[PDB]
């Protein structure tokens, strides 16, 4: 992340 906030 920051990319997929469930990373």
Task: Tell me the DSSP string of the chain.
Answer: --SSTT-
Q: How many other β-carbons are positioned within 10 Å of the β-carbon of residue 6?
A: 5
Q: How was this structure determined?
A: NMR
Residues in contact with 7: Cβ distance below 8 Å, sequence separation at least 6, in sequence order:
1
Task: Measure the N-to-C terminal CA separation of the chain; round to a whole number of Å.
Answer: 6
Report residue 7 as tokens. Answer: 């990373």
Report residue 6 as tokens. Answer: 């469930």
Report residue 1 as tokens. Answer: 């992340």
């Amino acid at each position: 992340c920051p990319x997929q906030p469930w990373c």
